[PDB]
Amino acid sequence: LTVKMGFIGFGKSANRYHLPYVMIRETLEVKTIFDLHVNEKAAAPFKEKGVNFTADLNELLTDPEIELITICTPAHTHYDLAKQAILAGKSVIVEKPFCDTLEHAEELFALGQEKGVVVMPYQNRRFDGDYLAMKQVVEQGFLGEINEVETHIDYYRPGSITEQGPKENGSFYGLGIHLMDRMIALFGRPDQVTYDIRNNEVSEAVDNYFDVDLHYGSKLKVKVKTNHSVASPYPRFIVHGSNGSFIKYGEDQQENDLKAGIMPDAPGFGEDSPMYYGEVTYRNGNGDWIKKQIKTPVGDYGRYYDAVYETLKNGAPQLVTKEQALTNIEILEAGFLNPSPSVYHLKE
Amino acid sequence: SLTVKMGFIGFGKSANRYHLPYVMIRETLEVKTIFDLHVNEKAAAPFKEKGVNFTADLNELLTDPEIELITICTPAHTHYDLAKQAILAGKSVIVEKPFCDTLEHAEELFALGQEKGVVVMPYQNRRFDGDYLAMKQVVEQGFLGEINEVETHIDYYRPGSITEQGPKENGSFYGLGIHLMDRMIALFGRPDQVTYDIRNNEVSEAVDNYFDVDLHYGSKLKVKVKTNHSVASPYPRFIVHGSNGSFIKYGEDQQENDLKAGIMPDAPGFGEDSPMYYGEVTYRNGNGDWIKKQIKTPVGDYGRYYDAVYETLKNGAPQLVTKEQALTNIEILEAGFLNPSPSVYHLKE
Amino acid sequence: LTVKMGFIGFGKSANRYHLPYVMIRETLEVKTIFDLHVNEKAAAPFKEKGVNFTADLNELLTDPEIELITICTPAHTHYDLAKQAILAGKSVIVEKPFCDTLEHAEELFALGQEKGVVVMPYQNRRFDGDYLAMKQVVEQGFLGEINEVETHIDYYRPGSITEQGPKENGSFYGLGIHLMDRMIALFGRPDQVTYDIRNNEVSEAVDNYFDVDLHYGSKLKVKVKTNHSVASPYPRFIVHGSNGSFIKYGEDQQENDLKAGIMPDAPGFGEDSPMYYGEVTYRNGNGDWIKKQIKTPVGDYGRYYDAVYETLKNGAPQLVTKEQALTNIEILEAGFLNPSPSVYHLKEN
Fold first, then answer.
1. Which domain holds residue C234?
2. Domain boundary among C92, C122, C152
3. Which residue of chain B comes nearest to A252, CA vs CA?
4. Domain stop point among A122, A147, A174
5. Contact B195 C192 (CB under 8 A)
6. Are strands B210-217 and B221-227 parallel, antiparallel or unpaired?
7. Which residue on chain B is closest to C338 by alpha carbon?
8. Chains C and A make contact, 3+ CB pairs within 8 Å
9. Which terminus has fewer CB within 10 Å in chain B: N or C?
10. Could you tell me if B140 lies within 8 Å of chain A, comparing CB atoms?
11. Which of C15, C9, C14 is nearest to C73 (CA)?
């Protein structure tokens, strides 16, 4: 059949990274959307087609037909709202931040398990085109024993981050979470991490820069990096193995396209530019050098929902696991355990 | 009966190239009869096996109630005369370039079609060239913001090709300008005034083989249609500049070349652009970040002109080429010869 | 022997396009520099080396040792200061605008001739690397009969020019002057001109855009263009002839290097990036197609001064002739005689 879901929040986030992908997926049915201040203007198209709007949370929470809820309200509300949806017996999707403490994250996963429902952080970046190309190469084996993966998210916005505040407001908490998440889901939990978190423009300002390494033994390392003053781009992904390398330039364009007004069903949406296809350079068993492009997999944030669907409807393992989510939060937090630059050994 | 029954007045080169190959593979467009004083029974045989009937009467075509659409591919000088007969006979008409011999006549045809309750349009297949559809897609997606300029070319490196003097109808502006401006007019509308630079840059007294024409829209935007017969290194096929970025596109639609080479519309990758030729957009988002992208060139298919006609006749879709677009095009075209080049012309209104 | 010179103005333009080049040349000796408000800091490096500074103009004009003066003072004051210098028996170099009125320019050229001195507007851009490459290709003949040249100077500066003012402060007077001067120096006086001058952002503001055509008969035209909203650049030069084309991307970096603090004596100064080397695609007598690159000649604004040295030390003919100067002023002014776009026919000369 289909999955009936509801939305807690009808703001920017829900209208850009969620509804567009979901309103096009028939396996998913947006029955109710909640918001204390629903923008009727934008609500109009949705009201037609059949979705119901309300400022009554209880109305959404106690809807016996709704089985999934996505939380898009501002950060501080997530933990409390997630608990209410779990209490009401509905599976839950939480946009970052998942919670503000590792303890609370643990509890959200417990309550979910104790109520027989799925609870997961929204990790749409697991479906960026470039990441998918990188993941595909690593899984296919071409490069052999992988010794290093470098992943970036840079900008040329000098002077954009000058504000002073808590760690929750810097780039590591805003961007680092996405980069590490998809690398963790691929390579697992690292044994140690090194941090270089700071602001290369205004020392005392919240961090707008980070260079974090995830160490797996002595052979493999994954580097997540962000710099707000990069005019000429680094590859989006760099992979080096015993048999070869994989270098991919160009970032997934879903976000930019969405900000420009292009919807998920427009011609060529999520498709990468041939000039940005990653290139593999490796040697086979015979010792010959093979050099080809990897057609970037189609970028599609909607696949996150397709995954939730499979989990709720056909028992498929959930996309984001408790271990991945927690490992991620631990790393994130340890980043401020000691003065940067620091080194941190993962629990257990 | 779900299809649109049509006929053809003329079985010459253009019909066998830009029309029939596309319509004979479309279930919705049923070609019932083809008129022509000299058919060539050999070139016709393959069509008769598919159902189309041939005749040299013309009155047989304009006479039966089954035919509701006629495309005129006959020589230029016969277009007005024939379009009028078809319209008066109660049929919608598609006329190849040129629509008419004069503006007054063009207005008459549109007026007649209107009082007979039928659709009348000039054939504008180049509104479906791949490069054009890419440029059009970019303008519609708004990456470039406020557009200030568009340059569109149809150039060749054929020195010594145009050398004979002749009437305006025989030159490059009349042969290619119409196409270039028509698709641009479809996007931006009727301009305020036009600038003309029309001549032959090899033999002065000969028919024009070169043109650089600017369509002005206010003080902000202008579209430049241009043609030169002595260009070794090609200009981009399209140049679009706006407040937020640019779109440059090299390479031309290959439908024509493929057709000439014997490749039919149903052939593998027909109309598909070469990746090395994908247009490139360079713009900056609201954040101020610069973005460089390639635009997967939309498939070129002149057959969509007939798909649009089908939707207009069978269903109620708006016609592709409007009366305003067609009349604005003929006017600018004729005005270009009103005064000796270089000159400036203010559109009526 | 050297040419003893003086400067009327110690502003930024004098410290950018003049002194850096002249201070590294033995043939040119900078004696005195005048400015109503010279800042000692920027002057210190000059004090030693032997150059004297004065706040009294007459101290420079009455110096019998000086034979050449360069006017770098603000526009409005060019005619008057140029006249005084000439009346003092000095040859002068005037930065744009040469004069405020045509009659005045004619007067200076007359005074100069009367009292045996050289009078010329400063046109350093006749030495931009790209222009010299285009110029070389023209002289060598590869292209055959030249049918068209397009030359640009664009920026991506949306919302930059927003104030209205005299035509004198617009882009055509500011940039067009340089673009046309070097084209006139090569192709001569055109018979008619085409004008498209406006501000593509705020119609009422001073012009920030121009597309101007110089017509040479019916075969050749030179297009000079400026647009402040161009994200993906046009070629710096485009040349098409009966035998081939020449496309040159990439602008001369002297201005940028100077702007960045690099002096003319720095490693590779004036040298072009191999990736920006212009390309010629032409056909030889045998019909063979030859694709070659043209090593961009070294850009060097100081060559304007070497040219001045040769003319007044030896007998060399001056770089900028009065004909070239007056023709330029004419085209410049005729661009505002009628509302744009318009057409103008140069006076029979």
1. 123-349
2. C122
3. B293
4. A122
5. no
6. antiparallel
7. B344
8. no
9. C
10. no
11. C9
